[PDB]
């Protein structure tokens, strides 16, 4: 997650402290997942071979 979240603790009564998202630092970037396309194509293939039978 590229977002740089700052911690803002605001008390709501005693001892209790809510941890809100602060103010973001840096340009907003969407979270992502990387999958090796090479590695993925064969794993998906071996399944359809086993599923064949």
């Amino acid at each position, epitope marked *: 997650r*590229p977002n740089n979240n700052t911690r803002k603790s605001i008390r709501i009564g005693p001892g209790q402290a809510f941890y809100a998202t602060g103010d973001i630092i840096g*340009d907003i*970037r*969407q979270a*992502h997942c990387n999958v090796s396309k090479a590695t993925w194509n064969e794993t998906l293939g071996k399944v359809v071979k086993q599923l064949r039978k």
Partner: antibody
Amino acid sequence: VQLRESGPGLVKPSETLSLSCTVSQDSRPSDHSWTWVRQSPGKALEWIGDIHYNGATTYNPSLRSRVRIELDQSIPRFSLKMTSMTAADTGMYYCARNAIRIYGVVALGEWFHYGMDVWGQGTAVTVSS
Amino acid sequence: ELTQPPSVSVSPGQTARITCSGAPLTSRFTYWYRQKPGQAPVLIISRSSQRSSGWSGRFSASWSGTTVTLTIRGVQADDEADYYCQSSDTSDSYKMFGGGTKLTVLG
């Protein structure tokens, strides 16, 4: 860093025209996208087609009938074609680089635009038989 | 398919105002550039990320609602040419140029 236009500069009213723009000393011209523009004799600037090293073409819908832009693969030196409509369109045409500064991940949509930063020497063309 | 004032005149050494009005002013910023007689345009303003764009080259710009503003710096001595507007569409496809201004200094 620098770039200059190239090609013939007159045309009969019919037929097509070919203009090429060579760019050199660029430290990374793959990601950067390129484009052409024009300035009518009545001092009215306009825009023509975006082109990029990926292979994405899209030109002005008011001109799509004629323009067809192509990018050469071996070395940076793209070209612009214009078919039927050519009369009065002439005046002078420029070569500019659509600067693409990227801040995130490509293919997701984090590639906001910087606009024109470096233009060509600026060549002139007129049609008049 | 946008609107730009062709002719505004203002006092030298004073601030000036350039406008460009249109609907797709939500998709891709503004841009302008300046056209000297017989020369190629140059970046008046740029964008490196989010707000840090106009800032301190001089100039500065504001975006109210339908139309945007190019609140230029205080001194306006001799920096005179023709100014246009660039920008893209809501579907990112194509770019429209809608003319622009030619300002002149008095005195």
